[PDB]
Amino acid sequence: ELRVGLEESELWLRFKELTNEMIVTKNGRRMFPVLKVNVSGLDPNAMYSFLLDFVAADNHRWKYVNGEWVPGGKPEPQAPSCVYIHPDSPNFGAHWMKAPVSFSKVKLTNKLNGGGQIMLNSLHKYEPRIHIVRVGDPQRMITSHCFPETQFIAVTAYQNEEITALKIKYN
Ligand SMILES: NC(=O)N1CCN(c2ccc(F)cc2)CC1
């Protein structure tokens, strides 16, 4: 059976309990934690590409008021559907399965200023999603997995001082 498991799920859960936040900048910012997954049940002999995108979680924005995240207004029009291709792509099933697959170099931005960056709307909530694409497939089979533990609000600056502190503590 194809199985895609989140690595360091207990680290992500320490951020999610505070409500996780990721900085977006003009030039783009790497994530912490990094999204890493373990993969089993690919065909070791087949070639696959791994893609990452971010799904908008809500029909509204968020705001941090009196130490709580609350609904903050109507949303901005959806960010364009940016996809990040894992740099090891395309590669053998055996490659993807022999060690966790790390998205350590993806950058999150709030300006379409290119460079394979992912544009997000500040004060909107997003859920990472990985796609596995089989190479040379006339059916163009894709598999998609979501990672609820990794939901976060995109911000231009940390709102929750407990998140600022945790980002330093574990990084
Ligand atoms: N005390 C805990 O149980 N946490 C904190 C550390 N955390 C972790 C995992 C990988 C890593 F690189 C850094 C930190 C795992 C969950």
Side-chain angles (χ1 to χ4, degrees):
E1 189 93 28
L2 173 62
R3 284 159 58 104
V4 185
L6 184 62
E7 289 276 328
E8 300 185 355
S9 58
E10 284 182 22
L11 181 51
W12 281 107
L13 279 303
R14 279 177 205 249
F15 285 88
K16 190 173 175 180
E17 78 176 287
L18 307 177
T19 304
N20 198 357
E21 303 180 37
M22 300 280 174
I23 308 294
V24 291
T25 65
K26 185 195 199 183
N27 292 337
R29 186 72 57 83
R30 280 183 300 274
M31 302 175 63
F32 187 84
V34 169
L35 179 56
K36 308 186 232 42
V37 296
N38 55 65
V39 181
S40 70
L42 292 175
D43 182 343
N45 305 317
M47 295 192 77
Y48 307 87
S49 304
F50 273 59
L51 277 41
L52 164 70
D53 74 343
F54 295 79
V55 179
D58 311 301
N59 74 353
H60 70 259
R61 77 180 131 200
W62 290 91
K63 55 183 161 45
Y64 193 72
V65 177
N66 299 332
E68 319 311 331
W69 287 101
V70 296
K74 274 196 156 213
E76 295 171 25
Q78 299 227 307
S81 276
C82 298
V83 175
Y84 176 74
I85 300 161
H86 192 286
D88 287 7
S89 299
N91 225 311
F92 292 105
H95 174 87
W96 300 115
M97 295 191 285
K98 68 195 177 171
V101 180
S102 167
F103 290 82
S104 63
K105 304 298 185 143
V106 64
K107 277 179 180 174
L108 306 184
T109 191
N110 61 172
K111 280 276 217 291
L112 42 263
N113 72 317
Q117 286 177 2
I118 299 284
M119 170 136 103
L120 297 184
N121 295 330
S122 46
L123 298 184
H124 300 63
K125 185 173 290 190
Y126 294 94
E127 183 175 83
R129 176 170 68 174
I130 291 165
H131 311 269
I132 302 173
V133 181
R134 188 158 59 198
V135 166
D137 183 6
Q139 295 190 103
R140 321 200 307 265
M141 184 175 169
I142 296 168
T143 75
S144 305
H145 282 85
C146 294
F147 296 95
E149 294 99 333
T150 72
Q151 285 160 7
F152 63 87
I153 301 171
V155 301
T156 59
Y158 294 138
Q159 304 295 287
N160 183 350
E161 74 291 343
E162 288 200 351
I163 284 288
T164 304
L166 238 226
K167 295 271 181 160
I168 282 159
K169 182 167 160 62
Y170 286 134
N171 195 8

PDB file of all heavy atoms in Angstrom, residues 2-4 24 32 35 38 48 63 65 89 97 100 144 162:
ATOM      1  N   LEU A   2       0.654   2.230  -0.866  1.00  0.00           N
ATOM      2  CA  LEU A   2       1.373   3.535  -0.787  1.00  0.00           C
ATOM      3  C   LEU A   2       1.039   4.154   0.569  1.00  0.00           C
ATOM      4  O   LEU A   2      -0.133   4.335   0.894  1.00  0.00           O
ATOM      5  CB  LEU A   2       0.979   4.467  -1.935  1.00  0.00           C
ATOM      6  CG  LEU A   2       1.509   5.900  -1.874  1.00  0.00           C
ATOM      7  CD1 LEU A   2       3.021   5.939  -1.907  1.00  0.00           C
ATOM      8  CD2 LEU A   2       0.924   6.724  -2.980  1.00  0.00           C
ATOM      9  N   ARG A   3       2.058   4.550   1.318  1.00  0.00           N
ATOM     10  CA  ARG A   3       1.908   5.219   2.628  1.00  0.00           C
ATOM     11  C   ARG A   3       2.868   6.405   2.630  1.00  0.00           C
ATOM     12  O   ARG A   3       4.071   6.181   2.397  1.00  0.00           O
ATOM     13  CB  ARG A   3       2.229   4.287   3.801  1.00  0.00           C
ATOM     14  CG  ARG A   3       1.132   3.276   4.104  1.00  0.00           C
ATOM     15  CD  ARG A   3       1.622   2.063   4.885  1.00  0.00           C
ATOM     16  NE  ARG A   3       2.235   2.405   6.168  1.00  0.00           N
ATOM     17  CZ  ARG A   3       1.667   2.251   7.369  1.00  0.00           C
ATOM     18  NH1 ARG A   3       0.438   1.771   7.481  1.00  0.00           N
ATOM     19  NH2 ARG A   3       2.334   2.585   8.462  1.00  0.00           N
ATOM     20  N   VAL A   4       2.352   7.602   2.929  1.00  0.00           N
ATOM     21  CA  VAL A   4       3.172   8.838   3.025  1.00  0.00           C
ATOM     22  C   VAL A   4       2.967   9.361   4.437  1.00  0.00           C
ATOM     23  O   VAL A   4       1.840   9.791   4.735  1.00  0.00           O
ATOM     24  CB  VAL A   4       2.770   9.881   1.970  1.00  0.00           C
ATOM     25  CG1 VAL A   4       3.719  11.085   2.012  1.00  0.00           C
ATOM     26  CG2 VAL A   4       2.790   9.249   0.584  1.00  0.00           C
ATOM     27  N   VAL A  24       6.066  35.235   5.527  1.00  0.00           N
ATOM     28  CA  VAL A  24       6.171  35.472   4.058  1.00  0.00           C
ATOM     29  C   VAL A  24       6.921  36.795   3.878  1.00  0.00           C
ATOM     30  O   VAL A  24       6.700  37.713   4.697  1.00  0.00           O
ATOM     31  CB  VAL A  24       4.798  35.440   3.368  1.00  0.00           C
ATOM     32  CG1 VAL A  24       4.253  34.021   3.389  1.00  0.00           C
ATOM     33  CG2 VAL A  24       3.802  36.418   3.978  1.00  0.00           C
ATOM     34  N   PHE A  32       9.980  26.730   8.896  1.00  0.00           N
ATOM     35  CA  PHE A  32      10.373  25.952  10.076  1.00  0.00           C
ATOM     36  C   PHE A  32       9.131  25.609  10.870  1.00  0.00           C
ATOM     37  O   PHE A  32       8.374  26.521  11.171  1.00  0.00           O
ATOM     38  CB  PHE A  32      11.407  26.638  10.987  1.00  0.00           C
ATOM     39  CG  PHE A  32      11.857  25.679  12.054  1.00  0.00           C
ATOM     40  CD1 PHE A  32      12.866  24.756  11.790  1.00  0.00           C
ATOM     41  CD2 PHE A  32      11.189  25.563  13.252  1.00  0.00           C
ATOM     42  CE1 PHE A  32      13.233  23.825  12.745  1.00  0.00           C
ATOM     43  CE2 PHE A  32      11.532  24.602  14.190  1.00  0.00           C
ATOM     44  CZ  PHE A  32      12.561  23.733  13.935  1.00  0.00           C
ATOM     45  N   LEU A  35       8.884  20.660   6.051  1.00  0.00           N
ATOM     46  CA  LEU A  35       7.992  19.515   5.733  1.00  0.00           C
ATOM     47  C   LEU A  35       8.843  18.353   5.239  1.00  0.00           C
ATOM     48  O   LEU A  35       9.502  18.540   4.196  1.00  0.00           O
ATOM     49  CB  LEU A  35       6.991  19.888   4.656  1.00  0.00           C
ATOM     50  CG  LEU A  35       6.060  18.757   4.278  1.00  0.00           C
ATOM     51  CD1 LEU A  35       5.299  18.212   5.476  1.00  0.00           C
ATOM     52  CD2 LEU A  35       5.102  19.157   3.160  1.00  0.00           C
ATOM     53  N   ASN A  38       8.066  10.384   5.041  1.00  0.00           N
ATOM     54  CA  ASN A  38       8.557   9.025   4.731  1.00  0.00           C
ATOM     55  C   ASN A  38       7.550   8.375   3.783  1.00  0.00           C
ATOM     56  O   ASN A  38       6.345   8.712   3.800  1.00  0.00           O
ATOM     57  CB  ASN A  38       8.801   8.217   5.999  1.00  0.00           C
ATOM     58  CG  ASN A  38       7.603   8.120   6.911  1.00  0.00           C
ATOM     59  OD1 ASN A  38       6.569   7.537   6.562  1.00  0.00           O
ATOM     60  ND2 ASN A  38       7.723   8.672   8.113  1.00  0.00           N
ATOM     61  N   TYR A  48       9.159   8.861 -10.446  1.00  0.00           N
ATOM     62  CA  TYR A  48       8.135   9.760  -9.909  1.00  0.00           C
ATOM     63  C   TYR A  48       8.741  11.142  -9.687  1.00  0.00           C
ATOM     64  O   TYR A  48       9.961  11.263  -9.410  1.00  0.00           O
ATOM     65  CB  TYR A  48       7.605   9.257  -8.574  1.00  0.00           C
ATOM     66  CG  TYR A  48       7.102   7.846  -8.546  1.00  0.00           C
ATOM     67  CD1 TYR A  48       7.940   6.778  -8.305  1.00  0.00           C
ATOM     68  CD2 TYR A  48       5.762   7.591  -8.756  1.00  0.00           C
ATOM     69  CE1 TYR A  48       7.472   5.478  -8.271  1.00  0.00           C
ATOM     70  CE2 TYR A  48       5.275   6.311  -8.745  1.00  0.00           C
ATOM     71  CZ  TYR A  48       6.129   5.238  -8.492  1.00  0.00           C
ATOM     72  OH  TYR A  48       5.722   3.938  -8.385  1.00  0.00           O
ATOM     73  N   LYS A  63      -7.131  37.065  12.398  1.00  0.00           N
ATOM     74  CA  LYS A  63      -6.414  38.146  13.111  1.00  0.00           C
ATOM     75  C   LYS A  63      -6.134  37.682  14.539  1.00  0.00           C
ATOM     76  O   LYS A  63      -6.873  36.814  15.047  1.00  0.00           O
ATOM     77  CB  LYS A  63      -7.181  39.469  13.065  1.00  0.00           C
ATOM     78  CG  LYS A  63      -8.612  39.442  13.569  1.00  0.00           C
ATOM     79  CD  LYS A  63      -9.274  40.805  13.399  1.00  0.00           C
ATOM     80  CE  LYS A  63     -10.791  40.814  13.428  1.00  0.00           C
ATOM     81  NZ  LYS A  63     -11.347  39.987  14.521  1.00  0.00           N
ATOM     82  N   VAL A  65      -5.992  38.722  18.242  1.00  0.00           N
ATOM     83  CA  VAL A  65      -6.678  39.718  19.109  1.00  0.00           C
ATOM     84  C   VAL A  65      -6.650  39.190  20.539  1.00  0.00           C
ATOM     85  O   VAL A  65      -7.153  38.121  20.794  1.00  0.00           O
ATOM     86  CB  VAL A  65      -8.103  40.011  18.626  1.00  0.00           C
ATOM     87  CG1 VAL A  65      -8.802  40.990  19.577  1.00  0.00           C
ATOM     88  CG2 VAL A  65      -8.072  40.544  17.203  1.00  0.00           C
ATOM     89  N   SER A  89      13.442  15.527  -8.312  1.00  0.00           N
ATOM     90  CA  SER A  89      12.495  15.052  -9.347  1.00  0.00           C
ATOM     91  C   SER A  89      13.136  15.123 -10.723  1.00  0.00           C
ATOM     92  O   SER A  89      13.839  16.090 -11.022  1.00  0.00           O
ATOM     93  CB  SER A  89      11.217  15.891  -9.344  1.00  0.00           C
ATOM     94  OG  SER A  89      10.546  15.814  -8.103  1.00  0.00           O
ATOM     95  N   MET A  97      12.045   6.400  -1.328  1.00  0.00           N
ATOM     96  CA  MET A  97      11.715   5.544  -0.172  1.00  0.00           C
ATOM     97  C   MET A  97      12.916   5.306   0.747  1.00  0.00           C
ATOM     98  O   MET A  97      12.679   4.815   1.854  1.00  0.00           O
ATOM     99  CB  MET A  97      11.165   4.195  -0.644  1.00  0.00           C
ATOM    100  CG  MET A  97       9.856   4.361  -1.347  1.00  0.00           C
ATOM    101  SD  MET A  97       8.971   2.819  -1.669  1.00  0.00           S
ATOM    102  CE  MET A  97       9.921   2.151  -3.044  1.00  0.00           C
ATOM    103  N   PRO A 100      13.823   9.978   4.314  1.00  0.00           N
ATOM    104  CA  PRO A 100      12.749  10.957   4.265  1.00  0.00           C
ATOM    105  C   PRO A 100      12.969  11.999   3.160  1.00  0.00           C
ATOM    106  O   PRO A 100      14.091  12.374   2.841  1.00  0.00           O
ATOM    107  CB  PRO A 100      12.803  11.621   5.650  1.00  0.00           C
ATOM    108  CG  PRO A 100      13.382  10.545   6.538  1.00  0.00           C
ATOM    109  CD  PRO A 100      14.366   9.762   5.674  1.00  0.00           C
ATOM    110  N   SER A 144      -2.315  12.474  -4.112  1.00  0.00           N
ATOM    111  CA  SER A 144      -2.309  13.715  -3.306  1.00  0.00           C
ATOM    112  C   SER A 144      -2.544  13.347  -1.844  1.00  0.00           C
ATOM    113  O   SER A 144      -3.503  12.598  -1.580  1.00  0.00           O
ATOM    114  CB  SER A 144      -3.335  14.680  -3.821  1.00  0.00           C
ATOM    115  OG  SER A 144      -3.111  14.932  -5.206  1.00  0.00           O
ATOM    116  N   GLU A 162       4.697  33.288  21.723  1.00  0.00           N
ATOM    117  CA  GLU A 162       5.031  31.864  22.026  1.00  0.00           C
ATOM    118  C   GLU A 162       5.535  31.210  20.738  1.00  0.00           C
ATOM    119  O   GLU A 162       6.397  30.316  20.846  1.00  0.00           O
ATOM    120  CB  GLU A 162       3.849  31.085  22.601  1.00  0.00           C
ATOM    121  CG  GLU A 162       3.527  31.498  24.034  1.00  0.00           C
ATOM    122  CD  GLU A 162       2.713  30.532  24.866  1.00  0.00           C
ATOM    123  OE1 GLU A 162       2.208  29.552  24.335  1.00  0.00           O
ATOM    124  OE2 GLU A 162       2.597  30.783  26.080  1.00  0.00           O
TER     125      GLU A 162
END
